[PDB]
Amino acid sequence: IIATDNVLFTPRDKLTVEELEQFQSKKFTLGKIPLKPPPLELLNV
Amino acid sequence: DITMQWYQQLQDASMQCVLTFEGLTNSKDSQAKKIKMDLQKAATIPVSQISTIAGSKLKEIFDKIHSLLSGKPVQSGGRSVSVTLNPQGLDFVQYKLAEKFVKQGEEEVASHHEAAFPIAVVASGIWELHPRVGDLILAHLHKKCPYSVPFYPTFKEGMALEDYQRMLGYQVKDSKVEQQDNFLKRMSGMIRLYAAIIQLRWPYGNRQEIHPHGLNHGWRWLAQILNMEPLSDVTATLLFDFLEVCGNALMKQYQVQFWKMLILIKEDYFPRIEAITSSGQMGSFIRLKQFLEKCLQHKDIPVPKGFLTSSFWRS
Ligand SMILES: [Cl-]
């Protein structure tokens, strides 16, 4: 079977500061939405 | 790059399947053809009957596929079929089953959007029990509809135009290609089915593990097409009929991060489409806007029309 990643929420750690600061902003930035799913901590923003 | 590598893996892995049962399709005997058709037959009828009105019949089809594929015998036209000591038949049936799942999203979900969900739950449970069938589902889904990866095929020099129109997913006869309206509908149904697979899970069976192709792949898909320039009519079409099918499950799973993604396409990606699309082909972008204006002020995305309910699972 071929490698496929299946994580619903990516951990806050192991995540790049780029993607962290996009999730933490009140608005996203066009052309830089993170590919990985958001983390569990910032679903209540 | 990361995604295109993964795309090639599933592609080249499906190509290895085309060769592993080589000689089962390439034969001139009377019995070699009788087996091939009988397996191709007893592996696609169940999926064709998925257009159902009760969970009681939808489970009959699920078990009929699971039996045929696990080694057990199954009822086909006239006589019962088996697969034990058919090592080519096992790898052959997973291919024909995986393509029939996509063919139904291509010639049934395109015409009737409601049929995506009964086909998605059944495809999701078989993927769960047989992850090889699921990788074959992604292989055909990806080639027939590259916009589901997502990746936009590029204008190629050095290759024939028909081969390039094949890349775009256009259905081509020996003479000519299909129109755009019939092609855009085929592409819609293929991602409405895919948007249904990543959110539904087969209820019965008591599965310890995670969703086979989880709802996470729905987040990246939206992220991965919105960070690239939109195509004139395709993107605004496929974007809408994806959010209508999986916007509800994505709102619940990703509460605020999805709304941020929605107040962006309205503010930033909508102006992006206005320049690229002529006044002659705005029909898609206008329905993409009517769909949001409701959802944005309602603070909720409607459940997809045709979602399976409790009454269905008792019937
Ligand atoms: Cl991936």
Numbering used by the authors:
A (entry chain C): 379 to 423
B (entry chain B): 384 to 698
Sentences reproduced from the published study:
At the cytoplasmic face of the NPC, Nxf1•Nxt1-bound mRNPs encounter the cytoplasmic filament nucleoporins Gle1, Nup42, and Nup214, which specifically activate the DEAD-box helicase DDX19 to remove Nxf1•Nxt1 from the mRNP8. DDX19 is a member of the DEAD-box helicase family, which are RNA-dependent ATPases composed of two RecA domains (referred to as DDX19NTD and DDX19CTD throughout the text). Gle1CTD plays an important organizational role by providing spatially separated binding sites for Nup42GBM and the DEAD-box helicase DDX19/scDbp5. A comprehensive structure-function analysis of DDX19 indicates that binding of Gle1CTD•Nup42GBM induces a conformational change in DDX19, thereby stimulating its ATPase activity.
